[PDB]
Each structure stands twice: as C-alpha cells, then as structure tokens.
RNA sequence: UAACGCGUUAAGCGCGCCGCCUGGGGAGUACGGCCGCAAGGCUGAAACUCAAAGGAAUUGACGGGGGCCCGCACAAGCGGUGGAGCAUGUGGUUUAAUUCGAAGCAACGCGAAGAACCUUACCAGGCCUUGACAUGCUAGGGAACCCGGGUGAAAGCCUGGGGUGCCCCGCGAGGGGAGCCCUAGCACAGGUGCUGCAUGGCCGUCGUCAGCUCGUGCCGUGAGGUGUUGGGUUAAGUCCCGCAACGAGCGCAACCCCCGCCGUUAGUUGCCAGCGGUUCGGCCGGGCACUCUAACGGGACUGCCCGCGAAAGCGGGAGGAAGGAGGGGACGACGUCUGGUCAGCAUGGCCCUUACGGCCUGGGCGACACACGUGCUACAAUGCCCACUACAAAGCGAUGCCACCCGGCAACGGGGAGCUAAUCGCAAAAAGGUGGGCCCAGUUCGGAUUGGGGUCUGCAACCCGACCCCAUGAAGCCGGAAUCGCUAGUAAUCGCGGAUCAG
C-alpha cells in the first residue's frame, strides 16, 4: 500500500485525460459506459498491433476515437478494409457517427504501456524474466529517455515463492510533479498463474 | 458479482422498488455512485487511468 | 583481447533489520596463452555485473610469466596467508598437473607442462593469489645473472 | 599473524636443549599403579556417540549498557471514555438460518457512501436443467413476435388465438437459405465452493520516520568498510567545517492545489459608493467604483539592521498583509509484516454440474442469562422553556428542489408560481441578543419505556421503517480500578450540507 498512480497524480498538470468531453449529470453516466465499451473492443481487437492509447473526444452524436498504435498498418488492413470493418462495428455498438483515425506511435521504446506489454509477452513466451527486464530498460534509455524502471511481480519462473524483480536507470522521480513520467501496466497470463508488469519511463523535466 | 445477479440487476422487475444499482464494470452491488454507475473501487481505478473526463484528484 | 576464465563465483550476505541482503563475488583470470596473465576479484550486487567488474580488475593486475618452452624456469613455493602453492616445472607432454584454481591461471599464462600441489588452506581466493604471486616471482639464468654480476656486468658479457 | 594483535620486555630473523598437542561429548570419568592420616592428588583409557566442537573478525538484532537527539511520548493543561439510557460494531450463546470476511497497536459506526421484499451469498418450502449470461454444433419442428385462459404464495406447469416478413432458384405449386424460436442430444455456460501459505491489482503498517543504496577510487586475504561517519546546524542524509574520497539514484525539499495582501483582464443571474426617479424591496434608471465571482500574475530571499558563530545558522528588531517551512493540503524511499482481500475485479491449482448452478415466496442477517469496542443524549441555573431579534460557509436540486395560498394542534395533504439554476428553491443557520417564565426539585433537569390515535414512502412497515400528536416520564444528582484526544483559530462548543438513498 504504497505509491500513487503516477498518472492520476500528474493528471491535469503534466498529463492529459484519455477522454475529453463535457456532459451534465444526466448524460455523463452512459457516455462514460459507451467509451468503456469502445475501449473494451479496440483493446481486444488490436493487441496484435501494439496499442498505446485510445483517445475519445466527443461532440454531440459525434465521437472521435483516436487510436495510438505501434504497427499502424495492422490496424488499417490490406486494401484499407480492416479499418472500415472496425468503424462499422464501432458505429454499431455505439449507434453514433464514429470517426476512427489512426496514429503512428513512432517510438515504442518510449511508450511505457508498450514496454510493459513487450515484457509481459516475453514473460508469457516463457523468456528469462530477469534478462527480459534489464534488456527492456536498456532499450528505453537507448532511445532518448532520461530514466526508466520495470517491475515484474508474481510467481517468477515456476516459483512456489512469489517474489518481485525490478530494475532502473537514470532518474525516475515519482515525487516530482513537473516530471513527465509515462506509466503503463501489462498483465502476463501463465500456466503457473498471473504476473504484473509495470514500466515507468521518465521523459523530461517541464 | 455472481453472474445471474448482474443480469437480474437489469431485468425490469415485478415491482418498481426492487430497482437496485450495480457497477457497470465489476458488477459490485455495494458502493455504487449514481453519476458514474461505478463503484468506489472502479471510480478510483478509472479516475487514475484518466478515463473519467474532467475528473481530477482533489486537494484543498 | 585475452581469454577470460571463471575461477569461482559466490554469494554473500549482509544484514538489515528485515532480511539478509546479498552481494556477489567473482574470481576471474585473463590470459593470452603466451606469458601474460592477470587476476581480478570483483564484487557487485548482480552476478554478471560482478564478472564484468572482475574482468576489468584482472586486466589491471597483469603478470608477465617468463615461459621457458611451455614450462616455468625453476621450481618455486609461495605462501599467502594460510595457503601455499608449489610449482615444480616439468618436461614436455606432462600437462598442467595442477588443481582446480592454479590450472586456470597457469593455462592462460601459456604454461603447458608443470607440477603442482596446494598445501595449507585450500581457499580458492588465497590459492588464486598465492599462484599469481608465485608467478610474479619467477626468474631466469639471465634475469638472475644480471642481478648478481650486475655491478660490473658487461665485462664478462 | 586467521585475525585480534606481536614488534630490541618479539608472537620478527636464526642455533641449541626440554615439556606438551593430534576432532567434540564420554572425562579428568573407568580400570591399574603410585602418593596421602583423611579430603583426595598424580598418571590416565576405551566402548559408545556426534558431524561438528572450536578461534578471531563482519553485518544485524537485542541489553533491566553508555552518549546525543526527536514525536502530544511523559510532563503542564482543557475536555472526555470506563458508570447511566439509547444508537451502532463485536465476543459469546441461541437458532431451521442468525451468510461471509476483518482479530494487539495496524479487528470491533471496519468491507456496508443505505439489509422490510430486492440487496442476499444463510435457512425452510415450491419450482427450472444447454440453463438468468457467451460462442457454437448434429437432428427434426417452426417466421420473429403479439395477446388470452387454467393451476399456483409466487416461480413454474399446462393450454387457446392472432401473425407469415427478408434473402436466392421458379411461370407456378414450391424447394433451398439468413436470422430468431422450440424439442432432443453434444461441446459448454454458471458457482460469493476451497486455498490471500500458489498470485496480479490495490490497501494497512513501521513512517512524512530520515533514512535505503549504487559507479568509480581507496582500505582489508576475506565477509565487509569507506562515502552515509565526526563537530556545528536543520522539520530533514537540511546545509556548514572536517575527512580517502568524488559523485549519483530512490527518498527530504522544490515544481501542484486551498487559505492570508495587492495587480491586470472580466460586469451577469453578483455588487450599491456619489447621482436621477421610488410603491421604501437596490425596486427602476444608470453605473462598476466597492463586495464578489475566477482565470492569469506580482509578492519573501535571512534581503535589511544589531548581537553570537571560522561557516552553516541562531537569538532579537525594522519596514511588510504576511518573516524565517506564513497556515492547511495533495505527495509514503530500499524494505518489514508468509500483514489484508480468491466475497470488488482478475487469476494458478483442487472441488460441484437435474447441483454447491438458476427462479421464486416466506424467514434470517435485527435472535439475548451476558461481555467489550465506538459513539449519541444527559445528569442541569455559565442551565431549561416560551416568544421576538441578528450574523455563515460549503453544497444540492426540472424524473427534482418546492416559494406562496388553503385545510389541519401537527406529521402532512390539496392547489400552484419560479428554477435545466451567482436569478427560483432547499434555507430556520444554532449557539448569540432583548423580554418573560422556572427557583435546587429526580424538578418546566433527563427523555428512555410503554399505551393510544394519525401521516408518508412502498406491491407490502407483524418479524423490521421514519415521522406527527395525546398520555406514560425509567436509569441517571458528573462515573471504580484503568484509560483517550488535542500545542491555536487547535481543543471545547454550536448549527449546515453532501454521498448511498422509494423510504
Ligand atoms: Mg514497497
Ligand atoms: Mg507485489
Ligand atoms: Mg465470478
Ligand atoms: Mg433499493
Ligand atoms: Mg620477469
Ligand atoms: Mg603459516
Ligand atoms: Mg626441464
Ligand atoms: Mg587444513
Ligand atoms: Mg577441506
Ligand atoms: Mg634482544
Ligand atoms: Mg609460536
Ligand atoms: Mg587421542
Ligand atoms: Mg574421539
Ligand atoms: Mg589430570
Ligand atoms: Mg581434579
Ligand atoms: Mg587436575
Ligand atoms: Mg583410580
Ligand atoms: Mg594409606
Ligand atoms: Mg603437576
Ligand atoms: Mg567469538
Ligand atoms: Mg540505548
Ligand atoms: Mg498529560
Ligand atoms: Mg479526567
Ligand atoms: Mg457507557
Ligand atoms: Mg460475523
Ligand atoms: Mg472466505
Ligand atoms: Mg446503514
Ligand atoms: Mg431477504
Ligand atoms: Mg429471496
Ligand atoms: Mg421472382
Ligand atoms: Mg413465396
Ligand atoms: Mg469461475
Ligand atoms: Mg498476504
Ligand atoms: Mg485471513
Ligand atoms: Mg583488493
Ligand atoms: Mg545510514
Ligand atoms: Mg520530514
Ligand atoms: Mg539529500
Ligand atoms: Mg437615493
Ligand atoms: Mg441594471
Ligand atoms: Mg493565485
Ligand atoms: Mg548571514
Ligand atoms: Mg515532497
Ligand atoms: Mg496469512
Ligand atoms: Mg449486520
Ligand atoms: Mg393552518
Ligand atoms: Mg406542503
Ligand atoms: Mg436563537
Ligand atoms: Mg433571562
Ligand atoms: Mg433513581
Ligand atoms: Mg440536582
Ligand atoms: Mg503537534
Ligand atoms: Mg448531519
Ligand atoms: Mg440527499
Ligand atoms: Zn466496480
């Protein structure tokens, strides 16, 4: 029972919300649940493309879902087909005019949610957990970053004794508010059980 | 949040008064906020993720 | 640009309220199989890191063994603490007839034939050091002749 | 030299000679021999049994060891708990069931920010079996869907009628097909069943305590040390001086929010200072001065003066709204607790599948010889009651808040205006002020308990709602041993709002 969610802390100061709209008490309840049904689906259907953020901006009967993705082709699809299928299935579950665009996360080495994931996969694929981490943190600092940190926790290896591995380089100042710090969390699901990967990436003093 | 009771939750019941809210997420019966249709656990979680719009953390 | 070897790796414990806390130690040899060998003992909190360290240290602590045809110029015996090594040079096709540690050190030195016994404490680390110190000490009817004549050398040579 | 240490008083370098050691326990025991007045001594085993016994040094922990420092920790206070009655939680016991977890601080008004049915996981009874929910599959019957009867506590069970859409082939009768439905059968779904000692996440905690560590260098055979220690300073591993150390990371601080002063921009639904008109209401003109509202900014740095100090900094003063972190917030280091939670969610493994799944109606979670925890209301005169009269903030509300009129002792009901709200409303703020009453009394203190008559919500207030009015008017006269909180706008005291919510 320790540290604060590094985002919700910085939220509004050095970090933005993933849903940006206004709604009165009357409407809010459902436009919320509507967002969560969207982010429910695109999260399942796009794990293959490595997806960082799902931005949901809103007007009136209008939804601008910006999907932030490593491999932007996989989202698009050959011919331009796959994206059309989504947009229809979206505007089905939404019943509104869904405006799904796609944005190329140009560097997955500085996207915490992705670094997290890449590790979790690696862990699921039965890779060495310690190495998996040092080597991830590695890749993060190599690409500009000013600080980074990854924490795998759970039944590491086979392990009856559930422990915690972690590693960091540079500064990861969780107390410093003006620090832009990306956080992401991945959950690895395994024959022996489930483990969690947190990845912190310190990006720049503002 | 047994499955049936999440469904029963939605069933428009024999009397107006067996109307009760659960969390649109976990299905939790108990600390459910009208306004979000979420419990005080889910609220907390989604709030930090940044997925409840305009929901800041307070401090005064 | 030498070969490295692992003499030994160990784990060791400190103490803090609420647990042991560990640290690793690596003993590493470094040789060029033609008369230069160095020994390094490095500790870090992670094992491969310790070895890196160890390897760095080894190259800074280097010793030129005067190899005389696969073997060492005379016999020699050297104590270090509790531990004591003896190196008796040997004839061709004898092999490094030496224990676990000294071998690694001798092999990378570039030695091929040599006799050996450890004696006293068998502790790796001190035996490691005793050997390196033994080799640090060898001389030659050459090395020696210069020491003794020396004070008018080059009248007879 | 293993180190501790030794170091011309050697434990160094050597020679001579003597004594002694050869794993721990058994054991300085047994046996034998010698000495002794005796007590007993000297000499001295093994069987057996263990896998160590040991020496020195390192980190830590602990000490009814020492030193310095801090926290409402003690002290100094103010007010309480422990007693009473009641509200809640819990132990126990009881029960058909009193679902389950929480268990020293860190469980006990805790999960529960809303248990009459629902919730609801427990119990009894009546029900369903591809199932209340997902994706399917094989075979037949069907459009989907809509309405009515029987039985029943409901669920369910049985049954009657209306209805023929869409896609392809065909002139057509019509065959095929998508979707949905029913019946049979199969994958399966469902499980708040177990394991928090298989876990993720999140949290409590030591502790907002000032610590925890790393790179390189250096010391040591080494575990490890150094730095981080010492002296001064600080809320602070905060800084200063010192030093085999020089830095760095997580922490402290800072960047963020609220309050205190002023600025610029902003004038409505807010504001009223001089002025015009007034039904005396800022009501109307008009104006944004002021109040305010709320978005950006300025302002404080030991900067100035005096005194002490190598320095850091400390004490005191001036200007200033604010002075040495101005007050409060958010923010919890490496780790500890095999801490908490499989009953939020997720999840490995084990277990059930006409039953541990699911539907319902009723009951239970509210039981009461008792015990504790947290709190409310009191025991009264620095009070109580009645009337008249002032001064808040923060929120909330168009399925709602409900102004004002009417009936009614009243709860409330009928009628009905404004308000998606700086406008309309909840809204009376209560302590306070003025007047009058009571006069030390179980009382005009206290308001339990019960009798009676109503109101509202709700399908339904027996178990088990709140509220109003009449009558009843219990304990209690300041609480034993123990024990809690708080260091300034704090404690004590007085009202107000909100979340959950038909209530
Ligand atoms: Mg931690
Ligand atoms: Mg963990
Ligand atoms: Mg479940
Ligand atoms: Mg309800
Ligand atoms: Mg030489
Ligand atoms: Mg010796
Ligand atoms: Mg030879
Ligand atoms: Mg030996
Ligand atoms: Mg041995
Ligand atoms: Mg002498
Ligand atoms: Mg001696
Ligand atoms: Mg013996
Ligand atoms: Mg023996
Ligand atoms: Mg004896
Ligand atoms: Mg004796
Ligand atoms: Mg004796
Ligand atoms: Mg005898
Ligand atoms: Mg005698
Ligand atoms: Mg004697
Ligand atoms: Mg000792
Ligand atoms: Mg002490
Ligand atoms: Mg006291
Ligand atoms: Mg007292
Ligand atoms: Mg009491
Ligand atoms: Mg219980
Ligand atoms: Mg349980
Ligand atoms: Mg309640
Ligand atoms: Mg019930
Ligand atoms: Mg029931
Ligand atoms: Mg046709
Ligand atoms: Mg036809
Ligand atoms: Mg399951
Ligand atoms: Mg645990
Ligand atoms: Mg438990
Ligand atoms: Mg060294
Ligand atoms: Mg320290
Ligand atoms: Mg502090
Ligand atoms: Mg510091
Ligand atoms: Mg006038
Ligand atoms: Mg006007
Ligand atoms: Mg400001
Ligand atoms: Mg000064
Ligand atoms: Mg801070
Ligand atoms: Mg446990
Ligand atoms: Mg209860
Ligand atoms: Mg009236
Ligand atoms: Mg009324
Ligand atoms: Mg009054
Ligand atoms: Mg009076
Ligand atoms: Mg009495
Ligand atoms: Mg009295
Ligand atoms: Mg204090
Ligand atoms: Mg209240
Ligand atoms: Mg309310
Ligand atoms: Zn929830």
UniProtKB/Swiss-Prot annotation, chain A:
Q: Does the keyword Translocase apply?
A: no
Source organism, top-level taxon: Bacteria
The name under which this protein is listed is Small ribosomal subunit protein uS3
Q: Does the keyword Methyltransferase apply?
A: no
**What does the UniProt record say this protein does?**
Binds the lower part of the 30S subunit head. Binds mRNA in the 70S ribosome, positioning it for translation.
PROSITE patterns to which the protein is assigned, alphabetical: KH_TYPE_2 (PS50823), RIBOSOMAL_S3 (PS00548)
Q: Which organism is it from?
A: Thermus thermophilus (strain ATCC 27634 / DSM 579 / HB8)
One GO biological process from the UniProt record?
translation
Which parts of the sequence belong to the KH type-2 domain?
38-106
What would you give as a GO molecular function for this chain, any one?
structural constituent of ribosome
- One Pfam family per UniProt: Ribosomal_S3_C
User: What are the disulphide bonds in this sequence?
Assistant: none
One Gene Ontology cellular component:
cytosolic small ribosomal subunit
Family the UniProt entry places it in: Belongs to the universal ribosomal protein uS3 family.
Q: Which gene encodes it?
A: rpsC
InterPro entries in the record: KH_dom, KH_dom-like_a/b, KH_dom_type_2, KH_sf_prok-type, Ribosomal_S3_C_sf, Ribosomal_uS3_bac-typ, Ribosomal_uS3_C, Ribosomal_uS3_CS
Keyword annotations for this protein, in alphabetical order, are:
Ribonucleoprotein, Ribosomal protein, RNA-binding, rRNA-binding
Quaternary data = Part of the 30S ribosomal subunit. Forms a tight complex with proteins S10 and S14.
Curated annotation (Swiss-Prot), chain B:
**Function per UniProt:** Required for the assembly of 30S particles and may also be responsible for determining the conformation of the 16S rRNA at the A site. Binds 16S rRNA in center of the 30S subunit head.
Per the UniProt record, the source organism is: Thermus thermophilus (strain ATCC 27634 / DSM 579 / HB8)
The parts of the chain that form a coiled coil are: none
Q: Which InterPro entries match?
A: Ribosomal_uS14 (IPR001209), Ribosomal_uS14_bact (IPR023053), Ribosomal_uS14_CS (IPR018271), Ribosomal_uS14_sf (IPR043140)
The reply to whether Membrane figures as a keyword in the UniProt entry is no
| Gene Ontology CC | cytoplasm; small ribosomal subunit
Q: What is this protein called?
A: Small ribosomal subunit protein uS14
Per UniProt, subunit arrangement is: Part of the 30S ribosomal subunit. Forms a tight complex with proteins S3 and S10, which cover it.
What does the record's cofactor remark say about binding?
Binds 1 zinc ion per subunit.
- Tell me which PANTHER family the record gives: 30S RIBOSOMAL PROTEIN S14, SMALL RIBOSOMAL SUBUNIT PROTEIN US14M
* Residues that coordinate or bind Zn(2+): 23, 26, 39, 42
Curated annotation (Swiss-Prot), chain C:
Give yes or no: UniProt keyword rRNA processing.
Answer: no
On whether Transferase is a keyword of this UniProt record, the answer is no
Question: What GO molecular-function term can you cite, just one?
Answer: rRNA binding
- Which keywords does this chain's UniProt record carry? Ribonucleoprotein, Ribosomal protein, RNA-binding, rRNA-binding
What's one GO BP annotation on this UniProt entry?
Answer: translation
**One cellular component (GO) term of this entry:** small ribosomal subunit
Q: Which domain of life is it from?
A: Bacteria
> Which SUPFAM superfamilies is this protein grouped with?
dsRNA-binding domain-like (SSF54768), Ribosomal protein S5 domain 2-like (SSF54211)
From the record, give the cysteines joined by S-S bonds. none
The record's Pfam families line, in alphabetical order, gives: Ribosomal_S5, Ribosomal_S5_C
Q: Where is the S5 DRBM domain?
A: 2-65
Protein function = With S4 and S12 plays an important role in translational accuracy. Located at the back of the 30S subunit body where it stabilizes the conformation of the head with respect to the body. Binds mRNA in the 70S ribosome, positioning it for translation.
Q: What family does the Swiss-Prot or TrEMBL record give for this protein? A: Belongs to the universal ribosomal protein uS5 family.
User: Any other comment in the entry?
Assistant: Is positioned such that it could physically interact with spectinomycin.
Self-association state and partner proteins as the record states? Part of the 30S ribosomal subunit. Contacts proteins S4 and S8.
Q: What is known of its domains?
A: The N-terminal domain interacts with the head of the 30S subunit; the C-terminal domain interacts with the body and contacts protein S4. The interaction surface between S4 and S5 is involved in control of translational fidelity.
- The protein in question is named Small ribosomal subunit protein uS5
């Amino acid at each position: 029972g320790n540290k604060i969610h590094p985002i919700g802390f910085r939220l509004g100061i050095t970090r933005d919300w993933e849903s940006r709209w206004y709604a009165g008490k009357k409407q809010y309840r459902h436009l919320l649940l509507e967002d969560q049904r969207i982010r429910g689906l695109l999260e399942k259907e796009l794990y293959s493309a490595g997806l960082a953020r799902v931005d949901i901006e809103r007007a009136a009967d209008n939804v601008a879902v910006t999907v932030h993705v490593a491999k932007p082709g996989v989202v698009i699809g050959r011919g331009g087909e796959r994206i059309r299928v989504l947009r229809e299935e979206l505007a089905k579950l939404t019943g509104k005019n869904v405006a799904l665009n796609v944005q190329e996360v140009q560097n997955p080495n500085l996207s915490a949610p992705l670094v997290a994931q890449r590790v979790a996969e690696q862990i699921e694929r039965r890779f060495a957990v310690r190495r998996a981490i040092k080597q991830a943190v590695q890749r993060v600092m190599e690409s500009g970053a000013k600080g980074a940190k990854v924490i795998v926790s759970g039944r590491i290896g086979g392990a009856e004794q559930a422990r915690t591995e972690w590693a960091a380089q540079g500064r990861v100042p969780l107390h410093t508010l003006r620090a832009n710090i990306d956080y992401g969390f991945a959950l690895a699901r395994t024959t022996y059980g489930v483990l969690g990967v947190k990845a912190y990436i310190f990006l720049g003093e503002v | 949040a047994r499955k049936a009771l999440i469904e029963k939750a939605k069933r428009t019941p024999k009397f107006k008064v067996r109307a009760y809210t659960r969390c649109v997420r976990c299905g939790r019966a108990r600390s459910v906020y009208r306004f979000f249709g979420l419990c005080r656990i889910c609220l907390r979680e989604l709030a930090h993720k940044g997925q409840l719009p305009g929901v800041r953390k307070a401090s005064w | 640009d030498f070969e490295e070897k692992m003499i030994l790796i160990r784990r060791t414990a400190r103490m803090q309220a609420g647990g042991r806390r560990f640290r690793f130690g690596a003993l590493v040899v470094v040789g060029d199989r033609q008369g230069r060998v160095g020994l390094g003992f490095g500790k870090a909190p992670e094992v491969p890191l310790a070895v890196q360290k160890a390897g760095y240290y080894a190259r800074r602590n280097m010793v030129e063994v005067p190899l005389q045809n696969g073997t060492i110029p005379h016999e020699i015996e050297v104590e270090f603490g509790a531990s004591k090594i003896v190196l008796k040079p040997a004839a061709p096709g004898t092999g490094v007839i030496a224990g676990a540690v000294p071998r690694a050190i001798l092999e990378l030195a570039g030695v091929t034939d040599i006799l050996t016994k450890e004696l006293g404490s068998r502790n790796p680390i001190n035996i490691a050091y005793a050997t390196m110190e033994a080799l640090r000490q060898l001389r030659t009817k050459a090395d020696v002749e210069r020491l003794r004549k020396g004070e008018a050398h080059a009248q007879a040579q």
